[PDB]
Every structure is written in C-alpha cells, then in structure tokens.
Amino acid sequence: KYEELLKTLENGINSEEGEIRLVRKSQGRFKEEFNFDLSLGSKPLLTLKVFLGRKPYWQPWVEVFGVNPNLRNVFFGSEAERKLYEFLSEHFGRIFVEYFEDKETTYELQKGVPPALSRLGFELLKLGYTYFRDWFIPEGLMEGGHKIQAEKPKTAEAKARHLANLKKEFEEFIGKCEDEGLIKKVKERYNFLEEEAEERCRLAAQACIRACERYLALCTESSREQRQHAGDCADLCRLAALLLERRSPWAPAACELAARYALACAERCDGDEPLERECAGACRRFVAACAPLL
Amino acid sequence: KYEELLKTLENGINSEEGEIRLVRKSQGRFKEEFNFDLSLGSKPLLTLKVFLGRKPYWQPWVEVFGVNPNLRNVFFGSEAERKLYEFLSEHFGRIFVEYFEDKETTYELQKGVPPALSRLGFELLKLGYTYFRDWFIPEGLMEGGHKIQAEKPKTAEAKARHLANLKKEFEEFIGKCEDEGLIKKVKERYNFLEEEAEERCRLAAQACIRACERYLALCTESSREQRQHAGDCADLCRLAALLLERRSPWAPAACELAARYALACAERCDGDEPLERECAGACRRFVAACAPLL
Amino acid sequence: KYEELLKTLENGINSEEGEIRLVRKSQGRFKEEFNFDLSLGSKPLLTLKVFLGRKPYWQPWVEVFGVNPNLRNVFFGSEAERKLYEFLSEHFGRIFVEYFEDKETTYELQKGVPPALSRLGFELLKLGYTYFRDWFIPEGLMEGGHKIQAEKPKTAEAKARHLANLKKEFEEFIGKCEDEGLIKKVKERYNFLEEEAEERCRLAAQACIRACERYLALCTESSREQRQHAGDCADLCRLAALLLERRSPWAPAACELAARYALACAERCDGDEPLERECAGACRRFVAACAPLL
Amino acid sequence: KYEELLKTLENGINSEEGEIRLVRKSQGRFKEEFNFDLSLGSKPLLTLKVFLGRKPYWQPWVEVFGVNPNLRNVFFGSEAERKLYEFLSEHFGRIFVEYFEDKETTYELQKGVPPALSRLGFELLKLGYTYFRDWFIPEGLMEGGHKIQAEKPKTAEAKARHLANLKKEFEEFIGKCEDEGLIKKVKERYNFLEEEAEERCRLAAQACIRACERYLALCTESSREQRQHAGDCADLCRLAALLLERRSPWAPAACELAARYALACAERCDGDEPLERECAGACRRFVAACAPLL
Fold first, then answer.
1. Is residue A139 assigned to a domain?
2. Is the peptide bond between D56 and the residue preceding it cis, with omega within 30 degrees of 0?
3. Whole-angstrom Cα distance, residue D160 to residue D172?
4. Which residues of B fall below an 8 Å CB-CB distance to C?
C-alpha cells in the first residue's frame, strides 16, 4: 500500500499549471511518519506528511502543509486542484489541508459558511469526503493552526446522515448571512452538486436502460420472468431519467421505486454471461447513484 | 317508465334455449305491486314481482321467483342468463334472485364464497351491481328464504368503496377455504375481473394523459407548479398504463405512486375552466380505478 | 315486533306539553301499511304511517305526517320532541318527518344548512340517525312534498363514513353562508355534539376505571397478567378521561391507545364472575364510546 | 493531563485480587507514545500503551496488552475488572483490549454475539463506551490480532444512534444463534440494560414533567397553545413514567405516543428564556431516552 502512492508521485502529476514531482522525500519522526517535499513546475510547492496506517489504533491519512503563497491565485480553482484531490482520495480516508495561504477560503470560512461549502471544501466534498472539522485554533500541541480536516463516510448510513446534517447547516447559514454575493456563490455550489448527483443517476439509468435493452433482445435464453424483470426495469429507469433531466421535484420519489426494482432486476438476471453481468452491474450502478436522493 | 319494460316483455326476449313471453300479468297486492308469470319455450318458467318505485320511501326493484327446476341444467350459464340480467339492469337499481333451484350457487354460497363471486352472482356483478346481501334464513320470521339481493352503486365513491370491500372478502375467503377446485373457479372469475379492473385503469390513465396533455398545452394561464404537476402526472400515468397493458406484476406498485401524484395533480390544477375540470376529473378517475389494485 | 310499539302507544307517552295517546288506529292500504292518528293533551295532533318490514324487499320505517300547526311554537325544542324520537329510534331504522309546519327548520334548510344540523335534524342526529335526504320537491308520486328522510347507519364503517361526510358539508356550509346568527346556532350545535360524544367517553372511562379498580382489588383469584392488564387499563382510561374533560385536541390520539388496550383488558379479564363481567363490559363500553373520535 | 493518570497509577489501584502498581514505565517509539508495564499482587500482569492525544490528527486512547494467562480465571468478572475500566474511562475516549487470553469472550465473540454484549464488552458498555470494533484478523497486514476497540459517544445523538444500532444487532443475533444457554446469558445482560434504559426514561420523564410544570406555572407570557402543549405533555410523561416504574409491557407503546408529543411540546415551547430552554431540553431528553424502546 506504500508504493502505490509513491509510484504515481515519482512518476509525476500532469497539470496545465506545471507538473508536480517529488523534490525531497523522507521517513518521518516515527516508524510510520513520512515527509514528502514536492515541486510544481520549477519551484518547491508544498510538503506532504503521510500515513499508511498502523492498525488498530491508527487510521490512514495525509496532511498538506507549507504551501507556496506565490502560487495562490494560479492553483486554487484549476485543473491542478481538482486532480490532486482525486489522486489522494484513492488512498486516504482522512485529509488535512492548510487554508492559511488560501485567501478565498479563510475569508469564506470566517464569513460563517459551512466548511464543506467553502471554495476549497466544495472540491473535497466532491471527492467523497463528507465529515468536516475546521481548525482555526492550534489548541496547544498543533503548529500551523489553520487547517481543514475532511473525512470519507464510514457507512452508507453515515453518508446520508451527514448530508442531511449539512443541509440543516446550509438552511441555518442562509438565514444568518447578510453577504448576498457570497450567499449566491454558495447557493449555486450547493445546487450544482445537487445537480451533479442527479446527472450521475441520469447516466447510470441511461447505461442501465441499454444494458437491459440488449439483455432482453440478444439473451434469448432467458426466463419469461427475466424478460419481464429487465423489460420493466428499463421502462422504469426511463421514467426516472426523464424526471432527473428536468430536475423535477417528484424525481427522488420516482428513483426510489426504480431502485428497488433495479436491484430486483439484477438479482434475477445476473449470471456468467457478460450480457447478464452488464445488466446486473448497470442495475447496481443506477441503484448506487440514487442513495444521495434517498 | 312502466311500459318501457312491459313493451320489451310482451315483445318477447330471444334466446337459443327458448323465447320468453308473458303468460299471465297482474297488478299486485298494492297499487305499485305487479306480478308477471313468464314462459320459456312452451313451458311457464318463473314469476316476476316488479316495482316502478313510489318515491320517496321506495326504491324501484325486481324480484324473480318460482323458477322451473326442470330448466336448471339448461339455463344457468347460457346466452339466456346473460341477456335477462342485461335487460333488467336497464330499469332496476336493485334485483332479488331466488337461488333455491340453482344447485351450483346454493352449493357455492354454502361453501363460503362471497355472494358476488358465486356462479350466479358473478353474472350480476358484471351487469353493474356491486352491493350484495344473501338471504338463506327463513327462520320463523321471513318468507322467500333463499334469495340474493344485489344493488347498483349509488356513486363512483361507493363503486370502488365496495370493490375494495369485496377484495378483502376474497382475501379472507381464500385463507379459509380448503376446497381447491372451487377456490380456483373463484380465483379465475376474480382474475377475469382483475383483468377488467386493470383495463379500466389503463383507459382511465389514457384519458388522464390526454387531459393533462391538453391542460399544459392550451391552458397557458397556469402556474409553473401546475405545468409541472400536470406535466409529470402525464408521464406517470404513461409508465403505469404501459405496465397495465402487459399485465405486469410490478404494475400495482407503479399505479400506487401515480395515484398519489394523480390526486396531487387534481388538487393543484382544478378550477372553473373545463380544461381544468377535465384534468382534475381524469386525475380522480385514474385514482378511482387503482383502488382494486391497492 | 308489531305490538311492542302499539303497547307503549296505547299506554301513552308522557310530556310536560300534554300526554299523547292513540285517537284512531287503522290497517293501511296494503297488508303491511298501518295508519295511526294520535292526540296531544285534548287535541288530535298527527298521523303515523308505520311499517314492521316485509322482508327481503322492505326495510322497516315510520312516517310522521299531518301535524298540528297550532302546536308549532310549543312542541319543537321541548321534552316532548326529544322523547318521541327516542321512542321511535328503538323500533325504526328509517324515519320520515314532515317539516312543512315547522317554520324554523324550513327556514334553516333553505338557508343552506345541512339537514342533520337543522334545528329538527340535530335532534334526530342525536338519536343515532346519520344518513339524510331532504325532500322539498314531491317528485311525482309523493303527496306532502316537504319531508326529511333520516336513517341509522348500517355499519360502524358507515357511521364514521357519514360523520366525515357531514364535517365536509359543515366546512363547506361555513365558507358559503353570510347569515352570522344562523352560522353560530349551527357552530354551537356542531360543537355541542362533538362535546356530548367526548362526555359519553369520559363517563364510559370513569365506570371502566372503577370496574377495573374493583377487579384488581377484590378478585384476588386472578393471574398477574390480569392484574397488570386491568391495572394499566385503569391508568389509561384515567389519562384519557383527563384529556376529554379539558376538551384537549390530543385526546382522540389518547383514546386510540386506551381503546386498543381496553379491548385487550376485556379479553383477558372476562369470565363467569360478575366482577369479571363488569370489567370486560366497562372495557367494551369505553371502547364503544371512542369510535366517534376514531 | 499526563500526570493525573500517572499519579493514580504509581499510587496503586486496590483490589480484592491484588493491588496493581507500575513495574516499568517508558516513553514510547514516538514523542506521544508511552509504554507502562504493571503488576497485580507479586506478579508482572500487563503492559499499557497510552496516548494523551496530539491534536488535531490524534484522539487520546489507551491499549491494554500482553496480559497474564495465569490470572485468567481470577480477574475477569471481579471487583478488579470493574474498577480498572472505571479508572480508564475518566481519561480515555477510546480503549483497546486484547481478548486473546480471555477464554470466555473469545468463545462468545466467535459464537456470533455483538462485541458490546460479550462478557468483557458488557462491562465496557456500562462505563460509557458505545461504539465497538472487533479485531480477530491478523491476516498478513495487522499486528495485535485479537483486540476490541471501544469508544465513548461523541453526542447525545450518537449515543441513542448507536444503542438503536445495537438493538438491531441483538434482534438479528437472537434470530441466528441456536446456543440457548449463551442466548440467555446475553438476553439477561441485555435485559439488565433494558432495565437501566427504562429507568433513564423514567427519570427523563420526571425532569420533563417538572420542566413543563414550572413552564406553564411561571412562564405567564406564553400562548394558550403553549400552555396546552406543555400541560398535556406533562400528563403524558406522567402516565408513561408510571408504566416504566412497574416495568409494564404496555409501556413502550405508551412512551411512543408521549415521545411524539414530547418533541411537539419542545418545538412550540422553546425560546431564549431558560424556563423555555429547560422545557424543550427536558422534552428532547425524554424523547432521547425512548429510542431503545422503539
């Protein structure tokens, strides 16, 4: 698990704003601490303190620290930002990000926005992190007291547990803030993610419709229960995907009936055959896309 | 109203099993009682005690009594049976039918079947009668001791009110009877009516789709909530009606979500306008068609 | 069934406004028609056309007709009114009452009040009649075209079916009428009956509490399940009866939990013993009082 | 925070089975790791690896490891067990306990019992720990392969969140295990905690009754809806608390109606005022106590 990250790091990470590569990597204060200085274009950018985990007391995590204030108006909001979080989310359940040098997020946080909805948090939100803790106080034994803790949900219970919690913080924030040009920049980000979750469902449904369409067509060896299961399942994902595309308010009520028959289509149509496997898989995907709506 | 019946009776009623004509007609015990002896082929068949009504204390009704036991294996289940009830349903809200000489229905009733689902009741069920009362007890108080009372529904509310009531009696009967060749002969009769019940829903949904289709189109004066309410409502009735036509097993699950939004479409789209009134009415109809499935 | 009524009629019916007795009784136009002229104090008051029933086509009913207009401001609203309906409700499912000579009810009906809520209907409402039909048109074959039809509910399903229907007519009437001194005289009658139904429950609960109180006390031979069943049952009827007395809005929600345990107390505590029989009976009563709230 | 524990450890911890004292204490692999060998009576018993916390990446925790298998039938279930967990719960949010040498718990865990309900877990459950993770797998990745993770709840929301989760695991376990002398040993342990859970509800209800009693009394500035909301709410918590004290079987049915009106009392009575805040808070508490029963 240690060299999967260190291979894609010495490899280098491509961006329009300069490629990153390791400048100085070291094994940290303890057996499991590691300290990686990195470089963006020509310049030394930031230091990465990482953790593979040391079971059972320790979770695995990554901290990003000591960033380059010269690169403050270039980096944040770029391809480079988006790609670096996508990289780290593949190996780290928790992530710690210094917002000391980010002028937008510091400002935003302090204006009272929920940490997930901040400019910088909004991006980590998108990469599967749901839990958030904002440190502005260094609280004794921590140096560099301006960091965001973010965590991927433990369960599917916790992921919709937190999202509900975030919505209440969003409703509360909106009935507190008087800054109306900030309040929009968060409303649009809040809504836009609501929209992205629907569009994933819309595409999951699309590929499920075709995966069923081909199933009933070309799998002639199939029970009549299976031709009905997949047949109806396709018409459902249809109606749902229609309501998603029009961001209809009745759509999550639709997706709920589709998902329970989608999982029912999967369980009766799956098999060794690849057309069967794709029907089931595309049923499971669509099902997996609807949890943010339910 | 008196001579519309007596003209089609002296005219005679054609059947493959003999034509019926009046043999002896008389004006009964009271001003409004009438007693008609009838003949099938050569033989005197039965007596008809009829009532044009004597408002406001009296409903209009017909009793059939004193039937010919020689014609017991010829009549019941023929063209002749079907046509005689179709005739009477055109003038009589209530109908009283002696099942003393019918060996199949007596037997069936006794075996515990709901009166509507009996061999003989099943036919009166088809001719628009919904309410049923089975008299088997001439217990020291009652003359005319083996007769079925049947009645046409007062409202569209009562017709789906009763059909729901019948379904519960059908579910209860099915979890009580051990006679498995009777239990099928009722399931199949119930089934055919389930099939009639789906097609009513399918057509109710059809006329609802168009009633919404025209609403959003030609009622330009309508809120954007109303254009979404009726717009989505149509797509629902669509998916449902698809599953009904293919007698799909997932269809009642579909109709359930449609009905709850169909009643929601009605309440937000109804008004003085006829296009509004038809949207609501066609929403209510579809809703009224789905009660036999839920 | 014929002489139970005719014995309490030749006996005479006591009132503060004069005693009624039969003046001329006769057997009517048909075998089952009967026509009874009656007398209040010295004077001939009204004629009663009655019906014991002639199964299975006929329900049993009583019509009151040809009343004394001199007794118009004396009778209506007296002890005499209340007692005469209480008498007739013991033998007649349906009742027909001429409102031609009643100046208050004619007026009220026409002002658009629901027939049950009229001055005269309100009293028949109290005596277990729920269904109502108001004849102002004589519709051909009826002489004296100013009569109220009233009927006792067929089931417990129909009694709360109709009461719900009446409430909607009451809400609709209240959003239509501009006569504000009539509108109160109906609001107070509507509310007052809501109140009387609660008070019956309150007293049914009271006698149930004591019937349980004595049970657990003096029936020492009783299971510990039974001492808990009746013990808890008493505490429930307590909390309920508290909320009823304060006409609390949360009371019907309370009565609902009490009733389901009241019927549970009955079924486990009943027996041959009279203290057992009274516990069960008082449990059933309380249960029977809560149906108007549920 | 470091020497509060190390002062009560060098002091020594008294038990009927021998007093514990530190034999060899050392500062561990990192700045914040500490490794304490301890002694029970004459013998070296176990090693304690502790953590004061190193914010913000680190929670504070204690691991117990390398225990004495000779002391296996003496310790577990004694005064000594109970007291050691009570000590540690005062400084540690999380606790890691090796169950390698405990024959009862290993066995029990394996038999499929939820970790909290095990012999050893049941005790840590009592000391305010709610979350549980059972490590049995040192599968080629993990050192320290037979240890129980246990954690104190973050909120009052999480504590009844988890207890509900445990109940479902208890219901699931009970419908899976065929070992009937184990299944009782867990039912009885679960039962005692059910009994603790009712008494919490009883006291939550008590403090809620008084919090409402004072509200309606001394908050004279209050709507008449609020005086009814809190007034009735108190009478409910009354009836419930009565049934809890008698461990009545109808009590959870009672608590269910109370809780839904308790949360309704809170939402309409809460405010800036402390008497308002205590009414709402005591309503929420009672509500929070009833989740283990529902």
1. yes
2. yes
3. 18
4. 29-31, 33, 51, 53-57, 61, 63, 96, 133, 135, 141-144, 147, 149
Distance CA A27, CA A207 (A): 46
Amino acid at D184: K
User: Domain for residue C193, yes or no?
Assistant: no
Question: Which residues, in sequence order, are bridge partners of residue D132?
Answer: D150
Does an H or E element contain A92, and which?
none
Residues C112/C96, Cβ–Cβ less than 8 Å = no
Residues contacting residue B206 through CB under 8 Å, at least 6 positions apart: B237, B241
Q: Residue A259's Cα: distance from chain center in Å?
A: 21
Contact C271, D287 (CB under 8 A): no
Token pair for residue D290? 């009833």
Q: Residue A192: inside a domain, yes or no?
A: no
Burial grade of D178 (CB within 10 A; 0-12, 13-18, 19 or more): exposed
Task: Give the span between the Cα atoms of A146 and C44, in whole angstroms.
Answer: 101
**Residue in B closest to C137 by C-alpha:** B56
To the nearest 5 percent, what fractions of chain C are helix, strand and coil? 55, 15, 30
Is there a single domain that holds both residue A72 and residue A212?
Answer: no
What resolution in angstrom units was achieved for this structure? Answer: 4.2
Residues 6+ apart with CB under 8 A from D76: D102, D104, D105, D119, D120
Instruction: For residue B226, give its domain range.
Output: 183-289
Smallest CA–CA distance, residue B239 to chain A, in Å, is: 7
**Minimum-distance CB partner of D257 among C248, C249, C257:** C257
Domain assignment present for D66: yes
- The secondary element (H helix, E strand) that includes residue C32 is none
- Which of B29, B30, B144 has the CB atom closest to C56's CB atom? B144
Q: Are C121 and C76 in contact (CB under 8 A)?
A: no
Tell me the C-alpha distance between C183 and C112, whole Å: 10
The verdict on C182 and C81 lying in the same domain is yes
Q: How far apart are CA C147 and CA C95, in angstroms?
A: 10
Question: At which residue do the structure tokens 């207890």 appear?
Answer: D163
Neighbours of A253 (CB within 10 A): 18
d(CA D241, CA D210): 13
- Is there a single domain that holds both residue B27 and residue B139? yes
What is the spatial distance between Cα C294 and Cα C286, in angstroms, rounded to a whole number? 13
CATH of the domain at C132: 3.40.630.30
Which residue's entry shows tokens 């008087």? A178
CA distance C7 to C22: 11
> In Å, how far is B203's CA from the nearest CA of chain A?
19
Token reading at C160:
């709360």
Listed as own residue / partner, the contacts of C1-4 with beta carbons closer than 8 Å and 24 or more positions apart are: C1/C52, C1/C53, C1/C91, C2/C52, C4/C91
- How far apart are alpha carbons D238 and D51 in whole angstroms? 46
d(CA C273, CA C258): 24
Give the Cα separation of D12 and D87 in Å (integer): 11
A232: nearest CB among B236, B243, B261:
B243
Of C9, C87, C3, C93, nearest in space to C47 by CA: C9
Residues D205 and D214: their CA atoms lie apart, in Å, by 14
Chains B and D touching, counted as 3 or more CB pairs less than 8 Å apart: no
Which spans in B175-247 are helix H?
180-218, 224-245
Pick the closest to residue A97 from A137, A69, A75, A124 (CA basis): A124
Adjacent-strand bridge partners of B190:
none
Amino acid of residue A155: T
Cα distance between residue A109 and residue A103, in whole Å:
10
CB contact under 8 A, C257 and D261: no
Q: How was this structure determined?
A: X-ray
Burial class (CB in 10 A: 0-12, 13-18, 19+), C35: middle
For chain A, the domain total comes to: 2
Same domain, C166 and C240: no
Query: Residue C270: which residues within 8 A CB-CB, separation 6 or more?
Result: C276, C277, C279, C280
Neighbours of A147 (CB within 10 A): 22
